[PDB]
Short mmCIF file of C-alpha atoms and ligand atoms in Angstrom, two decimals:
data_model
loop_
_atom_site.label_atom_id
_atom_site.label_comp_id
_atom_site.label_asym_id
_atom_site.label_seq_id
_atom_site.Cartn_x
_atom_site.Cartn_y
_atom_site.Cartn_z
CA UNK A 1 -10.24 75.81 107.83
CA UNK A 2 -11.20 72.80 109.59
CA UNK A 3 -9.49 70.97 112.69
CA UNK A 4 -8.45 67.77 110.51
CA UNK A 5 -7.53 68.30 106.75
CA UNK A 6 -6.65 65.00 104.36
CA UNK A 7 -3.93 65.73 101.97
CA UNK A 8 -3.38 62.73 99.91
CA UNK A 9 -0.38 64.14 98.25
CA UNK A 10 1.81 62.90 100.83
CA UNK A 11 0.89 59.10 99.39
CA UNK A 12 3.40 59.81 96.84
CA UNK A 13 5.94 59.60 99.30
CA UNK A 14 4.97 55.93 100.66
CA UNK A 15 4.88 55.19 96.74
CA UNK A 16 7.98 56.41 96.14
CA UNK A 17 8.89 53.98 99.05
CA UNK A 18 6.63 50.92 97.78
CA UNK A 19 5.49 51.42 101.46
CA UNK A 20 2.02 52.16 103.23
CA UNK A 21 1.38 54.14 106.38
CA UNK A 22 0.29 57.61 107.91
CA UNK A 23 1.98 60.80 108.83
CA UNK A 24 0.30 63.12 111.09
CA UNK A 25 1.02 66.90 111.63
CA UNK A 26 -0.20 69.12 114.10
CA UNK A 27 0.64 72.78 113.89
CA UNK A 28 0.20 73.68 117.36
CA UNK A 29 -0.13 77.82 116.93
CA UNK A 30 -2.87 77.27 114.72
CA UNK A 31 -4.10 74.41 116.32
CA UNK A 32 -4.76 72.69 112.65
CA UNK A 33 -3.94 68.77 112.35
CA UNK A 34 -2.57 67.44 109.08
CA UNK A 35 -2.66 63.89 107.64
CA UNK A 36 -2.47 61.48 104.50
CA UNK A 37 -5.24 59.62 105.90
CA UNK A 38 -7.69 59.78 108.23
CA UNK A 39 -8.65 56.26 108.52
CA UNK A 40 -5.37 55.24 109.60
CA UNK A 41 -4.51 58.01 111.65
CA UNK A 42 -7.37 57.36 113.85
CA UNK A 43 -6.21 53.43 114.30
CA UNK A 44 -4.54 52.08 117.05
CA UNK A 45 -1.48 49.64 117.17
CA UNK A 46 0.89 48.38 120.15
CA UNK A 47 2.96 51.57 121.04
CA UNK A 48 5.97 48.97 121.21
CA UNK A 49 9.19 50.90 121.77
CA UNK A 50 7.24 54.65 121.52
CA UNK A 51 5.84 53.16 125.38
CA UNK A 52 9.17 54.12 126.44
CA UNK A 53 7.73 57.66 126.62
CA UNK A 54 5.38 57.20 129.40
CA UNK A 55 7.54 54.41 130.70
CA UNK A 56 10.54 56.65 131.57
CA UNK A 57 7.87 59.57 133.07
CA UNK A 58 6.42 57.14 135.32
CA UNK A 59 10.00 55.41 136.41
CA UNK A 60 11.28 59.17 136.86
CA UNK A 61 8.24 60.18 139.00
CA UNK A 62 8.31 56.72 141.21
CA UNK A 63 12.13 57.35 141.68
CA UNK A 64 12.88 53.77 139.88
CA UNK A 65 14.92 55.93 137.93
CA UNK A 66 16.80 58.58 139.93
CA UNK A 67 18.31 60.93 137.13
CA UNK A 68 19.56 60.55 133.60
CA UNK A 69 23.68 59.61 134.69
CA UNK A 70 21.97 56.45 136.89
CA UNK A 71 23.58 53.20 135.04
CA UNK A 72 21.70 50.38 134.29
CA UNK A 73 23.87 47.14 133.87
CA UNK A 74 23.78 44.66 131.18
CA UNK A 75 22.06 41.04 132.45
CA UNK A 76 24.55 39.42 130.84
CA UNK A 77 22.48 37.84 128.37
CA UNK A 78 23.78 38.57 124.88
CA UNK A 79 20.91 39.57 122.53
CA UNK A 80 20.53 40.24 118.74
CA UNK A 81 21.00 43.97 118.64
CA UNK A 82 24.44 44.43 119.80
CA UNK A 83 23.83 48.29 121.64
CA UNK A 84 21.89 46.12 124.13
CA UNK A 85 24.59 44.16 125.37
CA UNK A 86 26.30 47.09 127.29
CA UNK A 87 25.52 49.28 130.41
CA UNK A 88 23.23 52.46 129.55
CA UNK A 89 21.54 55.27 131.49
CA UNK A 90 18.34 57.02 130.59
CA UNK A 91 19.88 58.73 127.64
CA UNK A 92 21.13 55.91 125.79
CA UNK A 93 18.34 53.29 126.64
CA UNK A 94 15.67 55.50 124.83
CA UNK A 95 18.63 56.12 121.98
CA UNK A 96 18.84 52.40 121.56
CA UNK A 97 15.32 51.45 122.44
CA UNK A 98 17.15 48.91 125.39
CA UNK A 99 13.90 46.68 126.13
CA UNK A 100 15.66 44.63 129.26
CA UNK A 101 16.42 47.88 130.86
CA UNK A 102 12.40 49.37 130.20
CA UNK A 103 11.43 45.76 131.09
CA UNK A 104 12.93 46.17 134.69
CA UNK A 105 11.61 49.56 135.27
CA UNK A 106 8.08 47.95 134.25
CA UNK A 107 8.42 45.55 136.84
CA UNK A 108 9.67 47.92 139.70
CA UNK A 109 6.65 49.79 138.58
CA UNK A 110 4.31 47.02 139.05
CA UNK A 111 0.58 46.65 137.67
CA UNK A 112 -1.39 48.94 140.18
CA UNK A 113 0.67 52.08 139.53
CA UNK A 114 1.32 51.19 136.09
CA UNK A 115 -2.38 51.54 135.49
CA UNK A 116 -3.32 54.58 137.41
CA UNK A 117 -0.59 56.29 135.22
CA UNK A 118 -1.25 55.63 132.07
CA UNK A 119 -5.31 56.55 132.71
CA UNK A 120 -3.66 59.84 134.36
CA UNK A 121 -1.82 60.34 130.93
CA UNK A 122 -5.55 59.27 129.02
CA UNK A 123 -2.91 57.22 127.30
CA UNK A 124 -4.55 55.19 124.30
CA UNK A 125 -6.60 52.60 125.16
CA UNK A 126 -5.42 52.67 128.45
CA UNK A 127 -4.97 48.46 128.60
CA UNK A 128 -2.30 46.83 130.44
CA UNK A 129 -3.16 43.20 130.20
CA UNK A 130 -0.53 41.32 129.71
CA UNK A 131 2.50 40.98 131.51
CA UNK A 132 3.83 44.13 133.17
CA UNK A 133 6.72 43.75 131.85
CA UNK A 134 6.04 43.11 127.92
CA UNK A 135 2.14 44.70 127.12
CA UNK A 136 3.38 47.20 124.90
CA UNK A 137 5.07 44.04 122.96
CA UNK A 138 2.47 41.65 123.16
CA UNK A 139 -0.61 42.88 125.68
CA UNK A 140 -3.56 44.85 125.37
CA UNK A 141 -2.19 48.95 125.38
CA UNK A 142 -3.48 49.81 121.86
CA UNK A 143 -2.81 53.50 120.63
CA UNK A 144 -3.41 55.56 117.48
CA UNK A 145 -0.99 58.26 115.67
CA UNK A 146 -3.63 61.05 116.72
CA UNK A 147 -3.87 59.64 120.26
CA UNK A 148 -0.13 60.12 120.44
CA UNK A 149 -0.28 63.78 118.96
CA UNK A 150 -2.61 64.22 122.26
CA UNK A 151 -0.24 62.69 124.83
CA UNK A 152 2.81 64.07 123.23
CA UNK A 153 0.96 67.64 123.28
CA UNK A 154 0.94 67.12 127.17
CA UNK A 155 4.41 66.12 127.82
CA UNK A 156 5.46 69.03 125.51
CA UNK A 157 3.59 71.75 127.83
CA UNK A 158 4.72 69.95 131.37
CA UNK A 159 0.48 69.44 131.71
CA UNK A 160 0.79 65.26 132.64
CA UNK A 161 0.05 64.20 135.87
CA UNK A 162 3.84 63.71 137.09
CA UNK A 163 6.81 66.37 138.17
CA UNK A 164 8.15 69.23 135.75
CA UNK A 165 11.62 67.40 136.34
CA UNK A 166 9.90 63.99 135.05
CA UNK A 167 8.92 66.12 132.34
CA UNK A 168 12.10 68.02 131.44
CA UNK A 169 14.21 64.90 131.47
CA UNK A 170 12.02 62.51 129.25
CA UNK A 171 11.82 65.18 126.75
CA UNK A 172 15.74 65.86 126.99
CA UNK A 173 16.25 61.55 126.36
CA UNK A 174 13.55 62.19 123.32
CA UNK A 175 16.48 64.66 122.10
CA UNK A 176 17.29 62.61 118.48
CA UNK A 177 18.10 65.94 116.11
CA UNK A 178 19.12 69.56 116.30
CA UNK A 179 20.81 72.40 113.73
CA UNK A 180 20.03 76.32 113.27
CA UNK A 181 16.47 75.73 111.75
CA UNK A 182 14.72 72.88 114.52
CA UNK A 183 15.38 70.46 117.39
CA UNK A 184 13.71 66.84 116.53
CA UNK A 185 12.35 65.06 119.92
CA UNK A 186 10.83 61.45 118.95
CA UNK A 187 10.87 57.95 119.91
CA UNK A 188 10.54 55.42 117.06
CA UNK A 189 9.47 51.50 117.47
CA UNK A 190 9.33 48.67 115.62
CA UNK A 191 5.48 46.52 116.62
CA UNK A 192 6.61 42.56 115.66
CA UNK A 193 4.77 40.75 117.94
CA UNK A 194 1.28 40.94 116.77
CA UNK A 195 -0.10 41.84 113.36
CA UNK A 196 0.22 43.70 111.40
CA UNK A 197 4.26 44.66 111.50
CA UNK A 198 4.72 48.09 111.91
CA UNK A 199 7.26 51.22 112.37
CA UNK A 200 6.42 53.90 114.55
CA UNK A 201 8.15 57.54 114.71
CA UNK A 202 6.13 60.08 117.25
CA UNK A 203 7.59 63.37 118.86
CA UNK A 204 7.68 67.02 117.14
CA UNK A 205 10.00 69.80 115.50
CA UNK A 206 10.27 73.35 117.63
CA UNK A 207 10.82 76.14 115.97
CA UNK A 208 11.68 79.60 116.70
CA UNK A 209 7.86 80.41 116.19
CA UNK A 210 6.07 77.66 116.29
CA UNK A 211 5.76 73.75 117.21
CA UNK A 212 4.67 70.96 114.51
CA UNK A 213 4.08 67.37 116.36
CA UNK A 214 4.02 64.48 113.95
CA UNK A 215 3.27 61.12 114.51
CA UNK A 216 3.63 58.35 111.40
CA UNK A 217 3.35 54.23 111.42
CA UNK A 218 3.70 52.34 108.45
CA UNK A 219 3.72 48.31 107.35
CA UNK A 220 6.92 46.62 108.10
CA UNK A 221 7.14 43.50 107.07
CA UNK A 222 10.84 43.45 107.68
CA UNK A 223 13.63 45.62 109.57
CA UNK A 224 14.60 46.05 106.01
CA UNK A 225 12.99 49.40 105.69
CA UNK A 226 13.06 50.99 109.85
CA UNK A 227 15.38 54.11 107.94
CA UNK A 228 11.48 54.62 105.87
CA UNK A 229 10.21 56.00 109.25
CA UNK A 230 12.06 58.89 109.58
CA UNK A 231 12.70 59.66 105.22
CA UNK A 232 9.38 59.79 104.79
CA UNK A 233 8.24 61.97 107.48
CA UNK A 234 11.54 64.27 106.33
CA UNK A 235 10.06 64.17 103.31
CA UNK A 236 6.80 65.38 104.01
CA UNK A 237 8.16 68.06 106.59
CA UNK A 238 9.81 69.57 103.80
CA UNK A 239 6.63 69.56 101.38
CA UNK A 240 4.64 71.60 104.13
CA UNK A 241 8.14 73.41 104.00
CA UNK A 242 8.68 72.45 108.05
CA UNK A 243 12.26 72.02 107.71
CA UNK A 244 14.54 72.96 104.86
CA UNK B 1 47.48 60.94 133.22
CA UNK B 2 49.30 64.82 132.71
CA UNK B 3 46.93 67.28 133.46
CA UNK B 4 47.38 69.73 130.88
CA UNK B 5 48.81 69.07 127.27
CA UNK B 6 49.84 71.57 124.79
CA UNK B 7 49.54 70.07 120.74
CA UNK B 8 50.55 72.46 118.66
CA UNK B 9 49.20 70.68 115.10
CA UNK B 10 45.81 72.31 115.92
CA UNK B 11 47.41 75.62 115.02
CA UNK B 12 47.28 74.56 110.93
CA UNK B 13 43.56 74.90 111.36
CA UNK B 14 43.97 78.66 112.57
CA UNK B 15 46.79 79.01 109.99
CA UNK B 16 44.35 77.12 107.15
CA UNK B 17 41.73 80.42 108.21
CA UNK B 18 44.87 83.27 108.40
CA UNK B 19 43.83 83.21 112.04
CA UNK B 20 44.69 83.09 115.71
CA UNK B 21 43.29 81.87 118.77
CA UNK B 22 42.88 78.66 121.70
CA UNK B 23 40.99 75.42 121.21
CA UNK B 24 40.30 74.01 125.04
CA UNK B 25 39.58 70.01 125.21
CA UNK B 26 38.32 68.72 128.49
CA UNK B 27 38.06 64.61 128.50
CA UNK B 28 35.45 63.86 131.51
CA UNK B 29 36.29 60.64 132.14
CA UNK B 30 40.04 60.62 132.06
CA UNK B 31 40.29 63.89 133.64
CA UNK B 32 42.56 65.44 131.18
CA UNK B 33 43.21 69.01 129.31
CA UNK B 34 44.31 69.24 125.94
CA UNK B 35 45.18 72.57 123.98
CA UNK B 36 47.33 74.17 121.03
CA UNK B 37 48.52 77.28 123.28
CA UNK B 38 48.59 76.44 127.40
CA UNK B 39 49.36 80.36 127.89
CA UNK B 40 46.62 81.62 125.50
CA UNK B 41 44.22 78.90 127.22
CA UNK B 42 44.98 80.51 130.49
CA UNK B 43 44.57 84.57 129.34
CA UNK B 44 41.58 85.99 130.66
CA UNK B 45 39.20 88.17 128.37
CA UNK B 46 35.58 89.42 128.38
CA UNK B 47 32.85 86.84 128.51
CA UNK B 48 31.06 88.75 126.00
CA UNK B 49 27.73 86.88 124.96
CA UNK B 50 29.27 83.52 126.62
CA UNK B 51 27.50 85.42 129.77
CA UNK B 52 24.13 84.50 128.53
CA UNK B 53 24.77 80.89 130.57
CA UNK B 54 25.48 82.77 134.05
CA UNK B 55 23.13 85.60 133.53
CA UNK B 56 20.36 82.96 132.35
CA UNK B 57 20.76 81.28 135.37
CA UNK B 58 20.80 84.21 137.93
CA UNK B 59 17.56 85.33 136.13
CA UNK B 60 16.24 82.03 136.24
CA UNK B 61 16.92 81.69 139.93
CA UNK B 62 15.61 84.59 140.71
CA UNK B 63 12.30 84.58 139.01
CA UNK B 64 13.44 87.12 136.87
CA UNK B 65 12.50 84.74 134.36
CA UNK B 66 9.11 82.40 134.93
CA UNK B 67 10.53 79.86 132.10
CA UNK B 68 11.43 79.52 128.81
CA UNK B 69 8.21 79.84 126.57
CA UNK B 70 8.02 83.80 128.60
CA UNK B 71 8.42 86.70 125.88
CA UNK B 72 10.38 89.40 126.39
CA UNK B 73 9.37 91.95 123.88
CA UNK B 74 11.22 94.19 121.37
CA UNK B 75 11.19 97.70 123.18
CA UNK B 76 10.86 99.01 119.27
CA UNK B 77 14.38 100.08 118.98
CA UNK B 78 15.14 99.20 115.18
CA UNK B 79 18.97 97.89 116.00
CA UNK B 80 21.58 96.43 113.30
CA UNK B 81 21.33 93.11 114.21
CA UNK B 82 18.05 92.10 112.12
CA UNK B 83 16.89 89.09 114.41
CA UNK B 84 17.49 91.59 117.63
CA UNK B 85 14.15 93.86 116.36
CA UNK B 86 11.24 91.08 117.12
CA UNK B 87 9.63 89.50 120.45
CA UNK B 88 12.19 86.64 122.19
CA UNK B 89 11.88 83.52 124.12
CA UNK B 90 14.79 82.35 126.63
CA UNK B 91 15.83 79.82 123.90
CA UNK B 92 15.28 82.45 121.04
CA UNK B 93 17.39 85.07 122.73
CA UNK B 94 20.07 82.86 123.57
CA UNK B 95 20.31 81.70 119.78
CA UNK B 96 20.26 85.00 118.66
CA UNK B 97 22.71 86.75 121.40
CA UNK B 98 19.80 89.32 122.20
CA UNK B 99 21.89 91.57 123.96
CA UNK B 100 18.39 94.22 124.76
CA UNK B 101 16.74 91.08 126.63
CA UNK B 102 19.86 90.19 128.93
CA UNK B 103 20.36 94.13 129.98
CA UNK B 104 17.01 94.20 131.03
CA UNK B 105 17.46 90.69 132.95
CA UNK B 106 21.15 92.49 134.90
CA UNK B 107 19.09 95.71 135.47
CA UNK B 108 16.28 93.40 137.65
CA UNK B 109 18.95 91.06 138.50
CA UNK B 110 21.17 93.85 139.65
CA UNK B 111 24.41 94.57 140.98
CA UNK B 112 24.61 93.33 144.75
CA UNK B 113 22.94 90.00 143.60
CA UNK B 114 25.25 89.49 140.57
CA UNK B 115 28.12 90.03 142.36
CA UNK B 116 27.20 87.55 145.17
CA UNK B 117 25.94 84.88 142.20
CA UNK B 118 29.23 85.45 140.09
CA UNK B 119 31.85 84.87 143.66
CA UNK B 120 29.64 81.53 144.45
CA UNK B 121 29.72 80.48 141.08
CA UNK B 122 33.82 81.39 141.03
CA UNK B 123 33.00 82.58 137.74
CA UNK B 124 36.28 84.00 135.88
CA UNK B 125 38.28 87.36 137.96
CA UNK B 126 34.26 87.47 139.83
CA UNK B 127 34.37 91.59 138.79
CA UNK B 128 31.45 93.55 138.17
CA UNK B 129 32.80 96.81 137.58
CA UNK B 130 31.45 99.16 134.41
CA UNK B 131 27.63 98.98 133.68
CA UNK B 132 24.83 96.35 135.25
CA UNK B 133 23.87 95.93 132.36
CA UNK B 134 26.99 96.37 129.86
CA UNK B 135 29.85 95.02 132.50
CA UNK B 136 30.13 91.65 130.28
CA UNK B 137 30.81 93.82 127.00
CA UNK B 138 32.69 96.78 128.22
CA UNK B 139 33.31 96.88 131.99
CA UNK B 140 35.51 94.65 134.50
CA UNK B 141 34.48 90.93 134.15
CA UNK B 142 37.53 88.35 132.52
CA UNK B 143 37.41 84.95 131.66
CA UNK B 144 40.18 82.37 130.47
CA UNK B 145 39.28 79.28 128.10
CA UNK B 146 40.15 77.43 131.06
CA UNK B 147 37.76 79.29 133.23
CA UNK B 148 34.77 78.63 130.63
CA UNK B 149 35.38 74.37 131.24
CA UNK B 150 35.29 75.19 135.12
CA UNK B 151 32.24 76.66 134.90
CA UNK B 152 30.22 74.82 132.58
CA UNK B 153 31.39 71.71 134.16
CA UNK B 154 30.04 72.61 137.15
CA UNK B 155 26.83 73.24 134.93
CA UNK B 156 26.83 69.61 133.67
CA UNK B 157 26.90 67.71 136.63
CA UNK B 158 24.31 70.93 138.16
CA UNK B 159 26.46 71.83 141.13
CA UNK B 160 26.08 75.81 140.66
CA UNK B 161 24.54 77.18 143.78
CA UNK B 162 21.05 77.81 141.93
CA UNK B 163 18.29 75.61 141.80
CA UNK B 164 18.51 71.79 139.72
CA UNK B 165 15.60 73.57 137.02
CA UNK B 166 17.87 76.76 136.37
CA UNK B 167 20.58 74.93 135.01
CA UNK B 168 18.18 72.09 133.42
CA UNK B 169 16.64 75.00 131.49
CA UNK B 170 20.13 76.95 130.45
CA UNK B 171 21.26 73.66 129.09
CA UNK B 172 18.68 73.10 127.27
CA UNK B 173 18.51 76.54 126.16
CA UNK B 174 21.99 76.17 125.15
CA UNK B 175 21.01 73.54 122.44
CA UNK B 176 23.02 73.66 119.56
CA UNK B 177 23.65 70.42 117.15
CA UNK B 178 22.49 66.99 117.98
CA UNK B 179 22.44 63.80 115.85
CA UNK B 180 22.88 60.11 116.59
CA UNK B 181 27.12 60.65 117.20
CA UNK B 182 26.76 63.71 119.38
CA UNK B 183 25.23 66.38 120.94
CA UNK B 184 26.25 69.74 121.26
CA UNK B 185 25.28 72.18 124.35
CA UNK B 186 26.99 75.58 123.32
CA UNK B 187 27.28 79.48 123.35
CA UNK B 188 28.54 81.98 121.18
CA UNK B 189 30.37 85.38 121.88
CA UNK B 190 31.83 88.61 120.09
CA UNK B 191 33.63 90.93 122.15
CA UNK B 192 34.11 94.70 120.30
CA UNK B 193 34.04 97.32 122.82
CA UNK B 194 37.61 96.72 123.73
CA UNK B 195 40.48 95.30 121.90
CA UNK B 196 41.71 92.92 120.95
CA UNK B 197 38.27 91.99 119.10
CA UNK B 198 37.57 88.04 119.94
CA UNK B 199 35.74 85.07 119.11
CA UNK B 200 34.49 82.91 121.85
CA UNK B 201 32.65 79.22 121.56
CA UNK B 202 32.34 76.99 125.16
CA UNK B 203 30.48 74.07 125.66
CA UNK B 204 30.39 71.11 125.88
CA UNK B 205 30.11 67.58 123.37
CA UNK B 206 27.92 64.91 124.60
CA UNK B 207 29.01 61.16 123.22
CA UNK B 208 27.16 57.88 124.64
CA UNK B 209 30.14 57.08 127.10
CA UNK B 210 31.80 60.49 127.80
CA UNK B 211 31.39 64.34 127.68
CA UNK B 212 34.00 66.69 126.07
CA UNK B 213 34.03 70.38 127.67
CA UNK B 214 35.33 73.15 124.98
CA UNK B 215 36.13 76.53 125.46
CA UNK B 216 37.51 78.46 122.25
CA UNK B 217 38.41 82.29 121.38
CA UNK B 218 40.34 83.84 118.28
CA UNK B 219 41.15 87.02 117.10
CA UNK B 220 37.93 88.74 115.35
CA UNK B 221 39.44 92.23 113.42
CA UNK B 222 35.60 91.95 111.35
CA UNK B 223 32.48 89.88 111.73
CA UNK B 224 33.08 88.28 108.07
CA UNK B 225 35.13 86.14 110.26
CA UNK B 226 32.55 84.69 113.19
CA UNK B 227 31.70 81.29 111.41
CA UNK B 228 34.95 80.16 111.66
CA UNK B 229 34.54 79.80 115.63
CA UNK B 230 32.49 76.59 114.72
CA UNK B 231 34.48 75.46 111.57
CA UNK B 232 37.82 75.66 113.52
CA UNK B 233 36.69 73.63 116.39
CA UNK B 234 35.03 71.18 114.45
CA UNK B 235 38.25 70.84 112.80
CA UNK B 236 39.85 70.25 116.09
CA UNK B 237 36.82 67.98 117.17
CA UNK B 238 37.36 66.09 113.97
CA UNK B 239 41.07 65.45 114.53
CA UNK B 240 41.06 64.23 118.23
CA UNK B 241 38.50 61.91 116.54
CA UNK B 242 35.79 62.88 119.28
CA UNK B 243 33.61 63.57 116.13
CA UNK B 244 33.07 61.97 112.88
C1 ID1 C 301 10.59 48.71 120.04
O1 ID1 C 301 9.58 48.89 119.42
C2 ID1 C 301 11.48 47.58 119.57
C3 ID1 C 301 11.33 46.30 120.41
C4 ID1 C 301 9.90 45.83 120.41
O2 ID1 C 301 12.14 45.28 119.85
C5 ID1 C 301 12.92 48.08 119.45
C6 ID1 C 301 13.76 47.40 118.36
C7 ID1 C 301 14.41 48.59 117.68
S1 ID1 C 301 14.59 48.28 115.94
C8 ID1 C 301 16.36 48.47 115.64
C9 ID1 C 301 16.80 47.46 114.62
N1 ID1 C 301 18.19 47.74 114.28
C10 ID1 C 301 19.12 47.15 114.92
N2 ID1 C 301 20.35 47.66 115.05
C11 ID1 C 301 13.43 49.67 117.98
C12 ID1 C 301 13.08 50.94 117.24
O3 ID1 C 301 13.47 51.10 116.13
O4 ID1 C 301 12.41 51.76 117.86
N3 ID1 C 301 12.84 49.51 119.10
BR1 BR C 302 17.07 69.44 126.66
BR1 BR C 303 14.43 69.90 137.67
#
């Protein structure tokens, strides 16, 4: 068939989930993409916490971060999700989703670099205005689910514009599940910022055969319903029969 | 702060399974051992298909093997292990213990270099004797429990003379179980050519704050027998509370 395919079944599972949103597939041996709707998998949102993707690759390959055992202490400043307020290294900051720590690597980054990187990557919209330190929060960088299926195809086949090593380690962090049928890599994020509210969970499921990348966002009004990001994704994985 | 320390309630989960064998704890941070048998711990046997880590990494190093996405294929030699008879990956053949894929690795690696590799990576009694490409299964190479934790914890913190990417790719190609508690970097052995018939599981447990090395064998009379390698140090895992 085609190289895009609409299968409105999967709406029964935001339904089921009084939700809204997209889920997109993208069976790599075939190279077939997948999706609920093709409207909203083509439109772009702040990559909030899923920046910490590219963010990590670029802090790797400028040597802000040295290797995944470097610590990076806690300000001090207590803040609302308690995992923050705590040393971490690359490992558990992506784990947690540790803004301050991602904020400082922005800044030892700095704008110049920033940009050339992320038009390297042909990340989204390719926008950093804003501050440096908070425009996947609140700046311009706008990106769609397919658009992340693209850049997450890169990273997965060590083709991006930075070191295999960079490469290697960012998609070790991304590590989030793993059994005897498929290793999960993924990031997820929350957008709160700017309207509309949103959940994002991008990365893919290897096989022994075969890759399938996925990226999904959906309305989230409130934190109330982050666990809907990765159920309903599950869900549909195991409708195309992905995953057991 | 005891080195070593023998606890001898671990030995109701071998009794629970009519069973025998070693558990090996190693707590990173505090530097100490913990065991149900300290002489068992300390008995040397034949690495069996826990060589896969060295012998991936000596192929690795040596260009043997160009990555892990290369495909060794299946030299059309129906054998009785099902999953054996097929085309293999690095991370495919390590999950499936494809014994075929390995031989042909030793027999390029061969014997002068995997003798020098083995003495710099002061890997168990160092001996080669027997077959290049059978020595692990049936010739002179022995390994203790406490051997295993030596060696892969010289893997963790990549200090094996071979390359940083080797032992980035043998990690990850030791992959076993990861969730949001832990991660689990393993590999599995059966050793039949000579008796006694064992068991072996070493790796290691990844936690947000510390790493728990592992090295396990037990007494394997039949096969029906091998998923109790995992069961019984889960069980052990569970207890010492480095697991939920
Ligand atoms: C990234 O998108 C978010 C940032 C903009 O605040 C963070 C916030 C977490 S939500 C976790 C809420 N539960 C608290 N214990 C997050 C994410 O889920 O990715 N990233
Ligand atoms: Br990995
Ligand atoms: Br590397």
């Amino acid at each position: 068939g085609k190289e895009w395919q609409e299968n409105k079944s999967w709406n029964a599972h935001f339904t089921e989930h009084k939700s809204q949103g997209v889920v997109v597939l993208w069976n790599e041996n075939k190279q077939q993409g997948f999706t609920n709707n093709l409207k909203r998998a083509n439109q772009a949102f702040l990559p909030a916490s899923t920046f910490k993707i590219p963010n990590s690759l670029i802090a790797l390959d400028l040597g802000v971060v040295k290797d995944e055992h470097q610590v990076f202490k806690w300000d001090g400043q207590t803040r609302d999700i308690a995992t923050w307020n705590r040393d971490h290294n690359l490992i558990t900051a992506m784990k947690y989703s540790v803004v301050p720590v991602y904020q400082e690597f922005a800044r030892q980054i700095g704008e110049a670099r920033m940009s050339k990187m992320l038009h390297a990557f042909d990340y989204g919209n390719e926008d950093i205005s804003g501050n440096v330190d908070s425009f996947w929060l609140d700046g311009g960088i706008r990106i769609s689910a397919t658009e992340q299926i693209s850049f997450l195809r890169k990273l997965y086949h060590n083709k991006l514009h930075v070191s295999e090593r960079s490469q290697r380690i960012v998609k070790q962090a991304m590590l989030t599940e793993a059994n005897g049928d498929y290793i999960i890599r993924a990031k997820t994020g929350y957008s709160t910022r700017i309207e509309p509210k949103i959940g994002w969970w991008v990365g893919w499921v290897e096989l022994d055969d075969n890759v399938w990348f996925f990226a999904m966002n959906m309305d989230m009004p409130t934190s109330d319903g982050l666990g809907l990001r990765q159920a309903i994704t599950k869900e549909v994985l195991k409708q195309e029969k992905i995953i057991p």
